[PDB]
Ligand binder design. Structure first.
Ligand SMILES: *[C@@H]1O[C@H](CO)[C@@H](O)[C@H](O)[C@H]1NC(C)=O
Ligand SMILES: [Cu+2]
Ligand SMILES: [Cu+2]
Ligand SMILES: [Mg+2]
Ligand SMILES: [Mg+2]
Ligand SMILES: [Mg+2]
Ligand SMILES: [O]
Ligand SMILES: [O]
Lengths: 325, 325
C-alpha cells in the first residue's frame, strides 16, 4: 500500500501510495507550471480518472501472482459435507436505470456578512436498479441445523469479443454481490435474501440538511436523537449493486458458494450482529468476521472446472440483466 | 463461331488450367496451329503475333507453374502480348486457335488474365459469360486450410464439401467485417472492374474507355464507403487513412496460398513502411503524393512540356484519376 504495518518500509517503500502521486502529477511532473495535485492525489476524486483503474489493475495483478501461487482447491477442500445447493433463482427482474439525485452546493459558495443564504443544489444522474430477492434452495442432510456462509458473486460468461470464458478465466473478473451467515435447518429449504440487505452495499447518505434538522429538533426540544438506523458510508452504493448491462440484455453467471459457517465465523459468533457492510468494510470496532481468505472460494486458480462442478455446496446459474434507458 | 460453340470453347480452355489440355481438339490445335501461318486473320497482319512468337522462341516468357502478378511489369507485359494477339483476331477461329496454342506455351496466370480481358474487349467475346475466377483459380479465393482438404480429398479420391471460415480469431476485431473484403463475389466485382477498365489500356487497342479515370475514383470511393458502413454495423470506428510516415496499425495474415509460389505473406500489426527494393522508396511515395496535391491546389496539371491543363472543370476529376491510378 504501504501502511505502517509494513515490516520493512525502508526496503519495500510505498508502491501504491507513491504511484497515486506519480500519476497525479504527470500534468506538471517537475513543478514548472505551479499546478495543484491531480485528481489521483485524493480519495474523493481518484476514481474520476480513467488511469485509476489501469493503475489498480496493475496492482491487482501483483496480488494475483501471490494468490495464483497456491495449489488449486480440491473437492475435499471445498465440500461442506451434507450441504447441497439444489437451486438458485431470483424473484424479480434484474433491471438497471438512471435516476436523479440532488445535493447542496451551499458550502461551496461564499456567504456575505449579514446577507441571507439561498438554496443552491446540484442534480446528478446516477445508476440504480430495481429490488430483487435471491431464492437459494439448500438441502441439509447433516443430522442437525448448521450455520452456513452464503457467498454470492456475479461472473461474466463471455468477453467483449463474444468468446466464452472458462471458469479460471472468469473467476478474477467476478464481482462480490453478497455474503451472509444463516442457520440452515435439516431438510430442504429455500433461503430468501433481499438485494437491499447486501453486506457489500450501503444506502445513499442522509443529506446535511436532514442531519441538521434532526439534530436541531432533538437539541431544541430536549429529545433523544436516535440515528442508529443509519448505516456506515463505507460500502458500494446500494444503487450500484449491479452492472449497467445493455438495453438488449446481457447474461451473466450468478455464482453461489455455501460454506461451513461454524468454521468461517469461529471466534466471531454466528449469532452476533456484523453490521451492514462487513464484506469489504468489516465490522466497526471488531475483528473481521469471516476467517476465509478474501474472495473465497474464487481466489485460487481453477485449472480443472470438474473440481468445482463436483462440489454439491457450489452452484452457478445464468441470469439476465436489462438496462432501461 | 456461334455463341454456344464460343462459350464451350472458353469453358474448355479454362478447364483444369494447371494441366495440359484434356480436350482432343484443343490438343490438336496446340500441336499444329501456327500463329504466323495466315496473317490475314489479324487486323494488324500479324504484328502482335510476331512479337509474342519471338518472345516465346527466345525462351523469354515466364514458365508454367509459377505465380503471376498483374502488378509485375514484365509478367503483365507478357500477358498483354497474348491479349494483343487475341484482340487482333478478325474471327473466332483465330481467337480460339491462338488461345489453345498459347495455353500450352505460356504461364497459366498470364494466360487466364489475357483470355479474360481478350473476351471482354473483343467484339468476338460478345455473349460469352466468363466462369467465376474463384472456380478457375480457386487458390486465389480460398484459404489454405480448405485447399488442403481439397488436396486431401483428391489424394484419397473421395468427394466432399468443406466449410470456409473467415480469417483470424474472435480476438481480432477486424474479423467482424471479414465478410466484406473476403466475399468471393466482392472479389470478382473488383477484379472485373479492373478488367473492364484496365490501367494499361491504350486506345490503339481499338476504342476509348469513357470517363475511366473518374469511374476509377468512384468505384473505389464506393468500396471505401461500403466498408465503413460494415464497420459502423459492427461497433467499429471508420478506417483511418494510410500515411507514408505513420504506422500501418492493422496487420493481416491471409492464411491463403498460391497454387505455385507458396503461402501469401503476412504483415504484422503496427509497422512503419519500409523501402521496397525494385519498387520505390517510401520517400518517393510522399513526393508523388505532394505532386498530385500540387496539381489539385494549383487548379491545373502540368504537361510534359510545362504547359498547364486546367482541372477547374468537370473533366478535372477524370484527369486526376488518370494521373493518380
Ligand atoms: C459445415 O456447414 C454445414 C452448414 O453450413 C453444416 O451442416 C456442417 O455441420 C458443417 N461442417 C462441419 C464439419 O462443421
Ligand atoms: Cu489506490
Ligand atoms: Cu481496385
Ligand atoms: Mg447493507
Ligand atoms: Mg469435486
Ligand atoms: Mg522466382
Ligand atoms: O485507491
Ligand atoms: O487507494
Amino acid at each position: 500500500e504501504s501502511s505502517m504495518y509494513s515490516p520493512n518500509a525502508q526496503y519495500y517503500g510505498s508502491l501504491h501510495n507513491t504511484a497515486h502521486v506519480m500519476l497525479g502529477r504527470q500534468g506538471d511532473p517537475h513543478g514548472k507550471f505551479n499546478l495543484p495535485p491531480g485528481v489521483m492525489e485524493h480519495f474523493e476524486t481518484a476514481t474520476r480518472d480513467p488511469s485509476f483503474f489501469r493503475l489498480h489493475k496493475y496492482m491487482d495483478n501483483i496480488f494475483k501472482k501471490h494468490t495464483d501461487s497456491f495449489p488449486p482447491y480440491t473437492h475435499d477442500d471445498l465440500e461442506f459435507a451434507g450441504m447441497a445447493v439444489d437451486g438458485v433463482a431470483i424473484d424479480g427482474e434484474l433491471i438497471t436505470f438512471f435516476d436523479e439525485f440532488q445535493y447542496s452546493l451551499i458550502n461551496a459558495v461564499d456567504s456575505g456578512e449579514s446577507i441571507e443564504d439561498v438554496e443552491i443544489n446540484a442534480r446528478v444522474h446516477r445508476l440504480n436498479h430495481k429490488e430483487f430477492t435471491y431464492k437459494i434452495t439448500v438441502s441439509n442432510s447433516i443430522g442437525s441445523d448448521h450455520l452456513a456462509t452464503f457467498r454470492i458473486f456475479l461472473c461474466p460468461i463471455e468477453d467483449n469479443n463474444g468468446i466464452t470464458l472458462t471458469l479460471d478465466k472468469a473467476r478474477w473478473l467476478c464481482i462480490e454481490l453478497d455474503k451472509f451467515f444463516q442457520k440452515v435447518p435439516s431438510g430442504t429449504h429455500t433461503i430468501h435474501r433481499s438485494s437491499k440487505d447486501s453486506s457489500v452495499t450501503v444506502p445513499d447518505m442522509p443529506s446535511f440538511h436532514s442531519l441538521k434538522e434532526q439534530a436541531d429538533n432533538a437539541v431544541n426540544g430536549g429529545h433523544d436523537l436516535d440515528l442508529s438506523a443509519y448505516e456506515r458510508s463505507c460500502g458500494i452504493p446500494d444503487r450500484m449493486l449491479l452492472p449497467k448491462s445493455k438495453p438488449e440484455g446481457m447474461e451473466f453467471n450468478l455464482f453461489v458458494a455455501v460454506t461451513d459457517g461454524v468454521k468461517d465465523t469461529e471466534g466471531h459468533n454466528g449469532d452476533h450482529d456484523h453490521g451492514g457492510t462487513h464484506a469489504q468494510c468489516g465490522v466497526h470496532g471488531e475483528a473481521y468476521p469471516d476467517n476465509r481468505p478474501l474472495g473465497y472460494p474464487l481466489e485460487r486458480r481453477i485449472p480443472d472446472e470438474r473440481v468445482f462442478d463436483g462440489v454439491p455446496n457450489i452452484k452457478h446459474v445464468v441470469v439476465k440483466i436489462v438496462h432501461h434507458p | 463461331s456461334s455463341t454456344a460453340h464460343k462459350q464451350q470453347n472458353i469453358n474448355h480452355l479454362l478447364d483444369k488450367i494447371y494441366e495440359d489440355t484434356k480436350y482432343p481438339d484443343l490438343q490438336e490445335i496446340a500441336k499444329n496451329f501456327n500463329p504466323l501461318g495466315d496473317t490475314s486473320m489479324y487486323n494488324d497482319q500479324g504484328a502482335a503475333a510476331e512479337v509474342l512468337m519471338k518472345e516465346l522462341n527466345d525462351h523469354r516468357l515466364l514458365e508454367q507453374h509459377h505465380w503471376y502478378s498483374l502488378f509485375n511489369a514484365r509478367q503483365r507485359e507478357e500477358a498483354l502480348m497474348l491479349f494483343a494477339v487475341l484482340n487482333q483476331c478478325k474471327v473466332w477461329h483465330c481467337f480460339r486457335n491462338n488461345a489453345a496454342y498459347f495455353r500450352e506455351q505460356m504461364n497459366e496466370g498470364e494466360f487466364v488474365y489475357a483470355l479474360y480481358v481478350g473476351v471482354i474487349h473483343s467484339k468476338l467475346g460478345d455473349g460469352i459469360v466468363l466462369p467465376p475466377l474463384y472456380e478457375i483459380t480457386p487458390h486465389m479465393f480460398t484459404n489454405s486450410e480448405v485447399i488442403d482438404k481439397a488436396y486431401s480429398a483428391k489424394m484419397t479420391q473421395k468427394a466432399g464439401t468443406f466449410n470456409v471460415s473467415f480469417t483470424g480469431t474472435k480476438k481480432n476485431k477486424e474479423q467482424r467485417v471479414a465478410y466484406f473484403g473476403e466475399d468471393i463475389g466482392m472479389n470478382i466485382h473488383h477484379v472485373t472492374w479492373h478488367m473492364d477498365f484496365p490501367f494499361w489500356w491504350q486506345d490503339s487497342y481499338g476504342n476509348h474507355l469513357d470517363r475511366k479515370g473518374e469511374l476509377f475514383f468512384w468505384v473505389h470511393h464506393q468500396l471505401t464507403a461500403r466498408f465503413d458502413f460494415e464497420r459502423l454495423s459492427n461497433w467499429l470506428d471508420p478506417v483511418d487513412e494510410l500515411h507514408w510516415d505513420r504506422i500501418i496499425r492493422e496487420g493481416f495474415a491471409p492464411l491463403t496460398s498460391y497454387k505455385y509460389g507458396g503461402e501469401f505473406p503476412v504483415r504484422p500489426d503496427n509497422i512503419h513502411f519500409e523501402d521496397v527494393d525494385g519498387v520505390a522508396h517510401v520517400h518517393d511515395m510522399e513526393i508523388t503524393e505532394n505532386r498530385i496535391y500540387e496539381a489539385i491546389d494549383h487548379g491545373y496539371i502540368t504537361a510534359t512540356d510545362g504547359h498547364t491543363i486546367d482541372i477547374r472543370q468537370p473533366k478535372g476529376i477524370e484527369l486526376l484519376g488518370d494521373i493518380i491510378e
